[PDB]
């Protein structure tokens, strides 16, 4: 968390816990490849939008070597793949339209 | 002839090639560019 | 693997028995498995 810009303090974190879909895949992979891990959520940005040649979000944390393996809902395309190295996809998405049935 | 059931073992296609070659990054980038641009949508509408 | 060719541009599936020897590019089409079975013939109006 980040306090008010007028006066800050030591970095404090409230230990919540995350559960869902990708987390179980992480657990299975860790059980197979026998490696440890420790999650931590991100604050600046949501998924990554290039501004002035910089980055933010999960990708921004990956590029600055702060993190090592982004996970969640990162979709692959041309621009992102030039900076990081994605793995084999495990789900199929795209672009779709949502309307209410008249 | 009719088709029934639901999809299982959902694994896509791919372009195979040997382990050591200099074309890998460029080929993957070209395929991704063709997907994002919209060329494959035109290709599917004509042949499949 | 015998050096006869260099690309397998073709409908090649992706699994774990092959991916240990050759390197696959990003998929250009997703799919799965599905049964195909013959269908019967409908009825009619018989004697009006």
CB half-sphere exposure, B15, CA atoms < 13 A: 16
Q: What share of chain A is helix, strand, coil (3-state, %, to 5)?
A: 25, 0, 75
d(CA A50, CA A79): 10
Flag whether residue C13 sits within 8 Å of chain B, measured between CB atoms: yes
Nearest by CB to A92, which of C14, C26, C30? C30
Nearest CA-CA partner of A92 in C14, C25, B42, C30: C30
| Resolution of the experimentally solved model in angstroms | 3.8
Flag whether residue B43 sits within 8 Å of chain C, measured between CB atoms: no
Q: Please state how this structure was obtained.
A: cryo-EM
With beta carbons less than 8 A apart as the criterion, state whether B15 and B24 touch.
Answer: no
Surface-to-core class of residue B27, CB atoms within 10 Å of its CB (0-12 exposed, 13-18 middle, 19+ buried): middle
Binding-site residues of C for glycine:
11, 13, 18
């Amino acid at each position: 968390i980040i306090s008010e810009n007028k006066t800050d303090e030591e970095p404090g974190y409230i230990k919540k816990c995350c559960k869902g879909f990708c987390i179980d895949i992480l657990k299975k992979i860790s059980k197979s490849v026998k490696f440890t891990y420790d999650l931590y959520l991100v604050t600046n940005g949501k998924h990554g939008k290039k501004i002035n040649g910089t980055w933010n979000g999960m990708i921004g944390e990956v590029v600055m070597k702060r993190a090592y393996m982004a996970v969640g809902s990162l979709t692959i395309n041309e621009e992102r793949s030039e900076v990081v190295d994605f793995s084999v996809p495990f789900i199929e998405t795209g672009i779709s339209v949502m309307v209410s049935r008249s | 002839l009719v088709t029934t059931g639901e999809l299982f073992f959902r694994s896509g296609f791919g372009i195979g090639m040997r382990k050591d070659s200099p074309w890998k990054q460029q080929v993957s980038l070209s395929i991704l560019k063709s997907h994002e641009n919209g060329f494959m949508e035109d290709l599917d509408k004509t042949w499949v | 693997l015998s050096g006869q060719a260099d690309m397998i541009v073709a409908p090649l599936t992706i699994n774990n028995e092959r991916a240990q020897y050759i390197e696959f590019s990003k998929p250009f089409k997703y799919q799965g498995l599905t049964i195909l079975v013959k269908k019967e013939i409908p009825r009619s109006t018989l004697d009006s």
